[PDB]
Design a protein around this nucleic acid. Structure first.
Lengths: 257, 53, 437, 133, 159, 50
RNA sequence: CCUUCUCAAACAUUCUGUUUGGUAGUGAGUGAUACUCUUUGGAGUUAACUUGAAAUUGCCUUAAA
């Protein structure tokens, strides 16, 4: 694996860059604070531009700090759950809160495909409602129908696009399946899209999030998974269009072109 | 006078959902279907208690 | 000294104990005995220095000494330049009279004239009224029993003169009796015209007693509440004090903010004095939180080391607000930034700000980023009756305060957009308010 | 005066050229109908232009469809002044990517990538950030 | 001839606009006597052995509608053009215009009554609508305004 | 601005009380063996008609 | 004025855990500099944001009559 010294140097340089020597936080609080890693590859999933999201395993996902630190911001972090019409009646908000309050996570609202096509049909209302939530969870069955119901605007960003979550046990709906899959997604996964292009980017979150050493460990874990997944290329750690910091250099991929 | 069975049941839910915090009960959407004032709720709770433990 | 060293009635002593103030202030210690003796007294005591209770207690003592029925006479009359001061004085009088059995009421400009007339007919032994409506009630209301005026006190005579009620004051003095009337008055200062007014009113030889960037934001009327909410949300973990022009509006805003799951503290005259002091102490010692207070409440109240001073509503005393920053900067370890909300039609206040010549800065915010809680607020108002009533009361109080603002050249009801204000308060349909437009 | 060319906007999704021709063909005869479309994607922009052989047919269509409600869309139709002939309107369809730039040898692009990496290191050094490799 | 206030009616909405308005109104038919009675009996049976949101319905009472107007609560008002006591409805259009509440004149009082389970409804108005139809309600309001106020801007003129 | 304030009553923001009274009356009638519940009517009619 | 591609397997059968596959969208506008690419003309990727479903031209027959 790549030495941790390079990642430590990159994160230290990012920390130095974040501080430099007109009231609300228009773009400044997000430009010099966002952490993302750019991964190059030979036409990632060039066969088709599927909207599939890859849930990279993370020991300490940013979701918990994001919720903790989202209090002191105009935008409030929220979780959206989308389930099929048949199983929505069985699912109860009180039960979800009771079985999830112990872990500390909460579900703001639960939606069904019927609601999206009737109450959120309006483009303006749809945009207003979708933008409220940062994390979207959708039943595996209804993800195929979601793009038609929710449009394509929500898929323009990683946060807005739905995330597949399993809710069936032995082919029958099980409450515990969703109850623990949501926990796994929240505190043990990191979604990321697979664009139909050479460049791939993963949003690691704000700089004030998980400690730099934990950030370095997360970067190494993500890099290992990406290497094991696709024949990736040169990788750089980048702030918002700030100077790129190379981290990995792959050469055998070029010969396979 | 006496309280109806439905009223007694509703007061029991108010009691073993909030207890004696009438301020919290005033905002109890699920149990306080009718947005009654704190004074009326406290009076009804006291009347129910007088006939029970 | 202490209140226990005076010939105060048992109910008055119990009320004073309920207030929580047991040590007499310098102004109180110097004015209470002469006032009880009946001697006319005038002074330049600063506003909020406890003079209100200082001259209210002798009035209650006189009422308890006479022990006349409510139908007999009108008792005491109090004149104050502003509606907010009238409300504060009425609240203080009610707190003091809780134990007492006498009657009290108000006559406020822009309020229900029929209700005030009915209350006056029923008989009020402690009336607090602005001169503008007091003259109308004296002149065009039969059955008034002002013939039995026993005492008369004027608060903030300088402000009354500045507003332009000097002719109204002269007419009131001419109409009111002077046989058994004991005349007093208090104000922050006193000019030659104020001295002449005192000489006209005070019958005997009266006793004389003596004792930073101007940050502002130009925001739309509809979006002012959302901008304030966003500022509070993103400024959490600090200490912020918000100044408003109505106690009802302060209460409604505090309740709404509490319901939106963010701790907030309220500080208004309508709140109980003991509760008021407890909340003030808690805010001072917390080191973190947001305080929503009225202009009159914080006019003379102590200002702890707060990071922000927000003037959400137009100031009740423009000169005092303009001059506050100079002393506020020196009185705080960390110079607290001053924030003011100005409507596009309220840009006239910039002329006065320039006349002050104090440093100023124009803050800016992006319209794209905003709390965007209008739909939730509308749903909550349409679903909750108590919240709807509180919001309506706050909107009514804000409109009444705006209509009564002395600076008519800068603030005008006609220029205001009622629809935008109602939307900011969460009402798609602006509730009707009896404003003499 | 007004010309036979007509400008129509607020077209509901799926209201393509064929449907416009079929619907407007009742009013006399239409010379030509064109609908704006995007290049990358073949979906229409919800606005197009149609020409009528006679001005009377154009004015009748404008009056009939001046504020016609069509499944959530209130169609607005305007008659352009004298002249103002319709311009070109390509019948754009969905565009599918085709790969052509793989002719360079792998060996040459290896050295090119090495040089680009060195230049990137030099540039990020020039930007005030100290880093190696 | 007739004065300007008379002949203001009979300038109803076009076929498409009226059809769309009636289609929208048909989704909020107030429960008839039988429907309400069966719902109440079911509720009683449930209570016998052991939280619904605000119901949505079209407000149609002449006195009720007039009360709704002048308070800006009403959003759309439908006015019958065949009211035998014309004085009962002569003032409605002008009052709505003064209050700014969108209004329209439809053909036949029996048509209004049919959508409210009544023999004849003088007026039919909407106060609150579901979020799903809010966009549809706004679109219908805009279409009605365009087709009535601008198309028939002279309805209040030329006797 | 509207014409008259007329502060809104609680009943507008509260479920109907007349409906509750009617429901209680129907409950009393059912308890007194006066009104057959619709389910009981359906059960009786299913046996009947054959 | 019609409604929207509401799941399929291998292992484990602790009754839900691991792995894989299935998701081709209203448009317009504003906009933070990196990836390759073929050498040229730009082809695909990359932060963020506004929107009334907004918009002036990129070279089968009984919802029969």
């Amino acid at each position: 694996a790549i030495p941790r010294e390079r990642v430590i140097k990159a994160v230290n340089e990012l920390i130095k860059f974040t501080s430099k020597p007109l009231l609300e936080d228009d773009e400044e609080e997000l430009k010099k604070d966002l952490q993302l890693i750019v991964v190059n590859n030979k036409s990632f999933t060039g066969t088709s531009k599927s909207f599939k999201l890859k849930l990279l395993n993370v020991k300490h996902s940013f979701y918990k700090p994001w919720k903790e630190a989202s209090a002191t911001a105009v935008k409030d972090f929220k979780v959206l759950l989308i389930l099929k019409d048949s199983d929505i009646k069985k699912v109860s908000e009180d039960d979800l809160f009771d079985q999830l309050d112990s872990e500390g996570i909460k579900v703001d609202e639960i939606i069904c495909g019927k609601d999206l096509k009737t109450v959120y049909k309006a483009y303006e209302a749809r945009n207003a409602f979708i933008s409220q939530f940062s994390l979207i969870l959708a039943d595996d069955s209804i993800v195929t129908s979601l793009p038609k119901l929710m449009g394509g605007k929500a898929y323009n960003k990683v946060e807005t696009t739905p995330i597949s979550i399993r809710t069936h046990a032995n082919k029958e709906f099980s409450l515990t399946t969703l109850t623990n899959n949501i926990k796994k997604v929240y505190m043990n996964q990191l979604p990321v899209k697979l664009p139909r292009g050479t460049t791939l980017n993963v949003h690691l979150g704000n700089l004030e999030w998980l400690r730099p050493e934990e950030f370095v460990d997360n970067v190494e874990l993500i890099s290992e998974q990406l290497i094991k997944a696709y024949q990736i290329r040169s990788i750089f750690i980048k702030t918002n269009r700030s100077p790129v910091l190379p981290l990995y250099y792959n050469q055998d991929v070029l010969d396979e072109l | 006078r006496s309280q109806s069975e439905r009223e007694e049941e509703w007061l029991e839910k108010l009691y073993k959902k909030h207890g004696d915090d009438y301020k919290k009960m005033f905002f109890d959407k699920k149990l306080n279907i009718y947005q009654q004032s704190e004074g009326d709720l406290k009076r009804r709770l006291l009347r129910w208690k007088k006939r029970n433990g | 000294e202490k209140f226990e060293e005076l010939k105060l009635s048992q109910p008055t002593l119990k009320a004073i104990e309920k207030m929580g103030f047991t040590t007499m202030t310098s102004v109180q210690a110097r004015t209470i005995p002469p006032l009880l003796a009946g001697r006319d007294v005038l002074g330049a005591a600063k506003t909020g220095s406890g003079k209100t209770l200082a001259f209210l207690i002798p009035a209650i003592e006189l009422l308890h000494s006479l022990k006349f029925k409510p139908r007999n006479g009108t008792g005491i009359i109090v004149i104050t330049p502003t509606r907010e001061l009238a409300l504060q004085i009425f609240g203080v009088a009610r707190e003091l009279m809780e134990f007492h059995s006498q009657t009290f009421g108000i006559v406020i400009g822009g309020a229900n004239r029929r209700q005030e007339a009915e209350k006056l007919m029923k008989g009020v032994n402690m009336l607090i009224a602005t001169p503008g409506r007091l003259l109308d009630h004296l002149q065009n209301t039969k059955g008034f029993v002002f013939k039995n005026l026993k005492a008369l006190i004027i608060d903030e005579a300088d402000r009354i003169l500045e507003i332009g009620f000097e002719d109204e004051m002269r007419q009131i003095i001419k109409i009111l009796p002077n046989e058994d009337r004991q005349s007093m008055l208090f104000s922050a200062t006193q000019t030659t015209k104020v001295e002449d007014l005192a000489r006209i009113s005070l019958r005997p030889g009266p006793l004389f007693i003596n004792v930073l960037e101007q940050g502002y934001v130009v925001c739309d009327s509809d979006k002012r509440f959302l901008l304030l909410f966003s500022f509070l949300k993103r400024n959490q973990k600090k200490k912020i004090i918000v100044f408003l022009s109505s106690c009802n509006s302060v209460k409604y805003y505090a309740e709404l903010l509490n319901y939106i799951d963010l701790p907030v503290l309220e500080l208004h005259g309508k709140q109980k004095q003991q509760k008021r002091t407890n909340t003030f102490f808690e805010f001072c010692n917390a080191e973190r939180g947001i305080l929503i207070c009225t202009d009159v409440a914080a006019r003379g109240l102590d200002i702890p080391a707060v990071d922000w001073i927000i003037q959400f509503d137009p100031p009740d005393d423009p000169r005092d607000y303009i001059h506050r920053v100079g002393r506020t900067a020196r009185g705080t370890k960390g110079k607290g930034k001053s924030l003011m909300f100005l409507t596009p039609n309220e840009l006239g206040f910039l002329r006065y700000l320039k006349a002050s010549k104090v440093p100023l800065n124009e803050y800016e915010f992006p319209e794209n980023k905003i709390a965007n809680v209008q739909s939730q607020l509308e749903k909550l108002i349409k679903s909750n009756y108590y919240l709807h009533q509180t919001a309506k009361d706050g909107y009514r109080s804000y409109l009444q305060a705006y209509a009564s603002h002395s600076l008519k050249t800068v603030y005008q009801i006609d220029k205001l957009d009622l629809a935008k204000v109602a939307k900011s308060y969460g009402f798609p349909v602006p509730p009707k308010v009896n404003i003499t437009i | 005066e007004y010309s036979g060319i007509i400008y129509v906007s607020r077209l509901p999704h799926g209201f393509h050229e064929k449907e416009l021709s079929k619907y407007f063909a009742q009013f006399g005869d239409l010379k030509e109908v064109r609908l704006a479309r995007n290049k990358k994607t073949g979906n229409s922009r919800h606005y197009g232009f149609l020409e009528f052989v006679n001005k009377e047919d154009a004015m009748i269509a404008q009056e009939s469809m001046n504020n016609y409600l069509l499944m959530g869309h209130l169609l607005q139709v305007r008659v352009l002044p004298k002249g103002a002939k319709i311009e070109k309107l390509y019948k754009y369809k969905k565009r599918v990517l085709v790969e052509k730039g793989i002719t360079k040898p792998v060996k040459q692009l290896k050295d090119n990538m090495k040089q680009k990496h060195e230049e990137r290191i030099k540039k990020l050094a020039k930007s005030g950030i100290e880093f190696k490799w | 001839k007739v004065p300007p206030t008379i002949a203001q009616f009979q300038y109803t909405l076009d076929r498409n606009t009226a059809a769309e308005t009636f289609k929208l109104f048909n989704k909020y038919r107030p429960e008839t006597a039988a429907e309400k009675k069966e719902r109440l009996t079911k509720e009683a049976a449930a209570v016998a052995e052991g939280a619904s949101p605000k119901p949505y319905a079209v407000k149609y009472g002449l006195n009720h509608v007039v009360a709704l107007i002048e308070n800006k609560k009403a959003k759309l008002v439908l006015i019958a053009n065949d009211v035998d006591p014309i004085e009962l409805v002569v003032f409605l259009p002008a009052l709505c215009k003064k209050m700014g509440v969108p209004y329209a004149i439809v053909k036949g009082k029996a048509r209004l009554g049919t959508l409210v389970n009544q023999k004849t409804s003088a007026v039919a108005a909407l106060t609150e609508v579901r979020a799903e139809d809010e966009a549809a309600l706004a679109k219908l309001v805009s279409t009605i305004d365009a087709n009535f106020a601008d198309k028939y801007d002279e309805v209040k003129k030329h006797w | 601005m509207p014409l008259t304030a007329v502060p809104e009553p609680k009943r507008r923001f509260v479920p109907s009380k007349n409906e509750a009274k009617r429901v209680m009356k129907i409950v009393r009638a059912i308890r007194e063996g006066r009104i057959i519940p619709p389910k009981k009517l359906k059960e009786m009619k299913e046996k009947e008609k054959i």
